[PDB]
Design a protein around this ligand. Structure first.
Ligand SMILES: O=c1ccn([C@@H]2O[C@H](COP(=O)(O)OP(=O)(O)O)[C@@H](O)[C@H]2O)c(=O)[nH]1
Lengths: 287, 255
């Protein structure tokens, strides 16, 4: 029975991932900078400290990160550091079965859809650049420290109980209220249910000696019109959709991935699809 | 005449670049952290760089840190500095920009020769951060209409430097004078943006390296790149080969 440490364990993804671990028979150990029935271990993400917070741990899921604000590369440097510390600490304790949470935001070139992991990364955001940097940090430790880091480029995560577009619809449709879309768009964006993302963490943790980079997508690229509709139906808010302006939005770009590689090497596929996932999220918002 | 700010205009490649710029007929301007050609001391804060840059027409961003610890943190400064510099450049409507990146973006021997469509695979923190600064230049190029050209240099040798080459499995070696030339040629394409491999075609095993030097004087992993893209979109190709450049370094050492 394995002890699995989850950085950013208390986060949104983290909570899905922690329980997937417990359901798998294993033991989740939540790492966090602070708190106010799982084991929590408080840490300051220093090398010297993690060394000790990981001394009885078998695997590590590295979920902890910052989202940014200023669009400046400086807002992420603390992550990059936190990452290298973790891998340093992992090495000391002789941990190699590690999962890193990367993102679809390593891609951008619409000419190239759908993106597979041979797509030249080309981030639009400083967030992207950073994530991409932590990926190679792991890569280097993997090739040179025999660490076994599996980078997971998650598609756009959605879940239950989270002001982003998808959350707005959830809330709005839930109170029976008109969903709006600034304009119509033809752009398609891939949405991966948090439960399925925690699933892929589990399956990647199965290939304990595997090290590489995998797209974890759902299917399953939707337009904003599609998203709104599907939420609308599931929430008894049929047809309650308003398009504020005529023409194309143009503030939105397409993003989805080819997840072949994950399917064959990780033997991974999603339990849910957008409509099934939201059917369930709805049936749980009554809390 | 053109006024061309050169960060790290002080260091090795800098001195070469700075003289090329003057020779091309333009006006060099070395930015530097200290004075311990027209020099301008900056602390490379955004506010400062905006002022130090408001009469400048182009920028050769060579200012960088080597790093000793193999820690990603040692390089965070180069990154902030780079973003600032580009914010500053945006403020002064400077768009023609050349970045010193490295062949160290690549690593997978299986793909040799490496071309720009090669998946990057940094082997050092040094390279990871160089890749980071590349994408900083890219995002600014696609969004704030800068025209940043990331040059991916091969390994540089020259005149007055205790590394191996200076002390006296193939590895592409680029003469600093050729590297410089490539900065000038990149600069002439003030509208172009993107990443270019700047190599010489000179992939030498350390054996050959030693030999070539012995003759012209009297006395590890494989890395080399395909540079079709530059010879094609920048008109760049090197004047010297390892043999011809050594001959010249020799002469310059007899003074
Ligand atoms: O954060 C900074 C700011 C400025 N410089 C400058 O960068 C120069 C060039 O470095 P180098 O001699 O290594 O040039 P290269 O290796 O690219 O030929 C120095 O001498 C500095 O004055 C630096 O290195 N780091």
């Amino acid at each position: 029975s394995l002890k699995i440490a989850v950085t950013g364990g208390t986060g949104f993804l983290g909570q899905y991932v922690v329980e997937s671990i417990k359901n798998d028979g294993n033991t989740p150990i939540i790492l966090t900078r602070s708190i106010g029935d799982y084991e929590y271990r408080v840490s300051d993400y220093t090398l010297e400290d993690l060394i000790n917070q990981l001394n009885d741990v078998d695997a590590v899921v590295h979920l902890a990160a910052t989202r940014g604000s200023q669009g400046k590369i400086s807002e992420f440097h603390d992550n990059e550091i936190l990452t290298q510390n973790l891998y340093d600490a992992c090495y000391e304790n002789n941990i190699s079965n590690i999962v890193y949470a990367s993102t679809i935001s390593a891609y951008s070139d619409e000419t190239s859809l759908p993106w597979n992991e041979k797509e030249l990364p080309l981030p639009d955001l400083m967030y992207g650049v950073s994530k991409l940097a932590c990926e190679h940090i792991g890569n280097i430790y993997s090739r040179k420290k025999g660490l076994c880091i599996k980078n997971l480029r998650f598609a756009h995560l959605y879940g239950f109980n989270e002001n982003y577009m998808i959350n707005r619809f959830f809330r709005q449709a839930f109170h029976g209220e008109q969903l709006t879309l600034h304009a119509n768009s033809v752009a398609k964006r891939e949405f991966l249910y948090a439960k399925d993302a925690a699933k892929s963490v589990i399956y990647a943790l199965k290939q304990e000696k595997v090290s590489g980079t995998f797209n974890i997508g759902s299917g399953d690229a939707l337009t904003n019109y599609e998203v709104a509709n599907t939420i609308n139906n599931a929430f008894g808010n049929k047809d309650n959709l308003l398009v504020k302006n005529p023409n194309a939005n143009e503030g939105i770009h397409s993003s989805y991935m080819d997840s072949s590689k994950a399917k064959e090497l990780l033997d991974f596929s999603t339990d849910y699809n957008f409509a099934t996932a939201v059917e369930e999220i709805h049936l749980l918002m009554r809390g």
